[PDB]
Design a protein around this motif. Structure first.
Motif, PDB file in Angstrom:
ATOM      1  N   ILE A 277       5.127  -0.187   5.199  1.00  0.00           N
ATOM      2  CA  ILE A 277       5.413  -0.443   4.093  1.00  0.00           C
ATOM      3  C   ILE A 277       5.193  -2.179   3.878  1.00  0.00           C
ATOM      4  CG2 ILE A 277       5.109  -0.991   1.448  1.00  0.00           C
ATOM      5  CD1 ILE A 277       3.604   1.999   2.070  1.00  0.00           C
ATOM      6  N   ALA A 278       4.070  -2.637   3.360  1.00  0.00           N
ATOM      7  CA  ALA A 278       4.349  -4.663   3.564  1.00  0.00           C
ATOM      8  C   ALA A 278       5.403  -4.783   2.373  1.00  0.00           C
ATOM      9  CB  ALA A 278       3.693  -5.563   3.237  1.00  0.00           C
TER      10      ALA A 278
ATOM     11  N   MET B  71       3.049  -3.696  -1.291  1.00  0.00           N
ATOM     12  CA  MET B  71       2.892  -3.899  -2.420  1.00  0.00           C
ATOM     13  C   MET B  71       3.235  -4.561  -2.538  1.00  0.00           C
ATOM     14  SD  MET B  71       5.542  -0.998  -2.324  1.00  0.00           S
ATOM     15  CE  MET B  71       3.955   0.666  -1.723  1.00  0.00           C
ATOM     16  N   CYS B  72       3.436  -5.509  -4.046  1.00  0.00           N
ATOM     17  CA  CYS B  72       4.433  -6.148  -4.932  1.00  0.00           C
ATOM     18  C   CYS B  72       5.379  -5.653  -4.944  1.00  0.00           C
ATOM     19  CB  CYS B  72       3.771  -6.568  -6.272  1.00  0.00           C
ATOM     20  SG  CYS B  72       3.916  -8.107  -7.490  1.00  0.00           S
ATOM     21  N   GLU B  73       6.559  -6.763  -4.994  1.00  0.00           N
ATOM     22  CA  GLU B  73       8.303  -6.477  -4.641  1.00  0.00           C
ATOM     23  C   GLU B  73       8.515  -6.420  -5.699  1.00  0.00           C
ATOM     24  OE1 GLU B  73      10.930  -8.486  -2.678  1.00  0.00           O
ATOM     25  OE2 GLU B  73       9.694 -11.001  -2.506  1.00  0.00           O
TER      26      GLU B  73
ATOM     27  N   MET C 213      -1.552  -2.513  -2.667  1.00  0.00           N
ATOM     28  CA  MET C 213      -3.214  -2.902  -2.981  1.00  0.00           C
ATOM     29  C   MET C 213      -3.093  -2.996  -1.133  1.00  0.00           C
ATOM     30  SD  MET C 213      -1.976  -6.518  -4.705  1.00  0.00           S
ATOM     31  CE  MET C 213      -0.251  -5.958  -4.777  1.00  0.00           C
ATOM     32  N   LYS C 214      -4.116  -2.691  -0.590  1.00  0.00           N
ATOM     33  CA  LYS C 214      -4.774  -2.715   0.671  1.00  0.00           C
ATOM     34  C   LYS C 214      -4.795  -3.425   1.731  1.00  0.00           C
ATOM     35  CE  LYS C 214      -8.249   0.333  -1.686  1.00  0.00           C
ATOM     36  NZ  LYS C 214     -10.116   0.014  -1.285  1.00  0.00           N
ATOM     37  N   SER C 215      -4.621  -4.500   1.667  1.00  0.00           N
ATOM     38  CA  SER C 215      -5.036  -5.752   2.571  1.00  0.00           C
ATOM     39  C   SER C 215      -3.632  -7.062   1.999  1.00  0.00           C
ATOM     40  CB  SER C 215      -6.277  -6.248   2.444  1.00  0.00           C
ATOM     41  OG  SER C 215      -6.194  -7.372   2.096  1.00  0.00           O
TER      42      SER C 215
ATOM     43  N   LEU D  83      -3.012  -9.350  -1.486  1.00  0.00           N
ATOM     44  CA  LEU D  83      -1.192  -9.383  -1.775  1.00  0.00           C
ATOM     45  C   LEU D  83      -1.347 -10.980  -1.960  1.00  0.00           C
ATOM     46  CD1 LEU D  83       1.251  -7.927  -2.649  1.00  0.00           C
ATOM     47  CD2 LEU D  83       1.848  -9.428   0.184  1.00  0.00           C
ATOM     48  N   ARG D  84      -1.134 -11.789  -1.728  1.00  0.00           N
ATOM     49  CA  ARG D  84      -1.704 -13.281  -2.057  1.00  0.00           C
ATOM     50  C   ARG D  84      -2.381 -13.169  -2.650  1.00  0.00           C
TER      51      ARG D  84
END
Ligand SMILES: CC(C)(COP(=O)(O)OP(=O)(O)OC[C@H]1O[C@@H](n2cnc3c(N)ncnc32)[C@H](O)[C@@H]1OP(=O)(O)O)[C@@H](O)C(=O)NCCC(=O)NCCSC(=O)CCC(=O)O
Ligand SMILES: [Zn+2]
Lengths: 274, 28
Positions: free
Chosen positions: A5-6, A32-34, A40-42, A46-47
């Motif tokens: 996970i990012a 994922m949003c912290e 989200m997939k990529s 996310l950006r």
């Protein structure tokens, strides 16, 4: 299937499987949003979200703040989506988590560390709004990047702090995991040694100790025996104040206080929700 | 309100309301 996970600036390897939709669960990585915990997939997806996303901290009410360290109380009925994201994210590191869909009867206490970009997730614990077994924690997790630094103990301490303010005695939900059991034992030893370092009376009942600490009488008794402090001489039950343990604990309390890995009751602004 | 588990190979049962005496080292 999900391997990593990012999460903010961290890339976290997962431990177990978690029931993310097979659309996402097919991928190796999950962005994922912290702050809101949407997944989200990529990286590029996310950006775009981060540029849109308003949230800089969990939802719910800040009931504890001491500088950069906060705790937010999130009602699972008023923030269902956030709490579900939180539960899916937890099951990535819990061998077995009881529940991820029906978050409405739970509160979630979310601990965060603030820097200049927002309040970042450290860990959390879920608590049943109304537990028949007077459990004061249902589940508890320290995010991997923050593990083995004293935050888990701070979360456990907080759950008992809430119990005291509620005038209840509490216990974590059975069954406890290996990691859960080691950390609760450490905490219970520390609470017991502290109490005995401060009591001067000639005698004490288990109930008395339970009343002050919000620790359940069975966990008190259980810890006494773990420490080999419960003896039976001349036909009676005694508590042995071991000089070694209190001495060793003092050195450990010095190191914890030398950092700031401790919860401070004067920073809690809370009244129980219902 | 009572609890059990052995201490030094002897099974014991204790109350959570009865005051327990605290002791330091003392010859036992
Ligand atoms: C249990 C926690 C929250 C612990 O958090 P932290 O690592 O930050 O703990 P800490 O405050 O730094 O330290 C706590 C004590 O445990 C020790 N300790 C911590 N991690 C250890 C590890 N891998 N191995 C050996 N010892 C460890 C520390 O040295 C310290 O002991 P000393 O002070 O003595 O040195 C975490 O490991 C975690 O999130 N694990 C995954 C989720 C989990 O297992 N939750 C608990 C399941 S219990 C439950 O009820 C939920 C399950 C369910 O019912 O759904
Ligand atoms: Zn977001």
């Amino acid at each position: 299937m999900i391997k990593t996970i990012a999460f903010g600036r961290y890339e976290l390897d997962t431990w177990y499987h978690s029931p993310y939709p097979e659309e996402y669960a097919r991928l190796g990585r999950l962005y994922m949003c912290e702050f809101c915990l949407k997944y989200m997939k990529s990286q590029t997806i996310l950006r775009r979200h981060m540029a849109k996303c308003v949230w800089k901290h969990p939802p719910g009410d800040e009931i504890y703040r001491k500088g950069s360290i906060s705790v937010f109380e999130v009602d699972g009925k008023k923030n269902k989506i956030y709490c579900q994201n939180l539960c899916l994210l937890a099951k990535l590191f819990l061998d077995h988590k009881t529940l991820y869909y029906d978050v409405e009867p739970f509160l979630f206490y979310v601990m965060t560390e603030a820097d200049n970009t927002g309040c970042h997730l450290i860990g959390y614990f879920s608590k049943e709004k109304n537990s028949f077994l007077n459990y004061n924690v249902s589940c508890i997790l320290t995010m991997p990047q923050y593990m083995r630094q004293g935050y888990g103990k701070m979360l456990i301490d907080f759950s008992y702090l809430l119990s005291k303010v509620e005038e209840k005695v509490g216990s974590p939900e059975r069954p406890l995991s290996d990691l859960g059991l080691i950390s609760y034992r450490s905490y219970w030893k520390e609470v017991l040694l502290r109490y005995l370092h401060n009591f001067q009376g000639k005698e004490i009942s288990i109930k008395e100790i339970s009343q002050e600490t919000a620790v359940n009488p069975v966990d008190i008794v259980s810890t006494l025996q773990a420490l080999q402090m419960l003896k039976y001489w001349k036909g009676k039950h005694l508590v042995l104040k071991r000089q070694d343990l209190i001495d060793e604990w003092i050195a450990k309390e010095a190191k914890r206080s030398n950092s700031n890995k401790t919860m401070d009751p004067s920073c809690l602004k809370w009244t129980p929700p219902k | 309100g009572m609890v059990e588990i052995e201490i030094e190979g002897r099974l014991h049962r204790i109350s959570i309301f009865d005051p327990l005496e605290i002791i330091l080292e003392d010859d036992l």
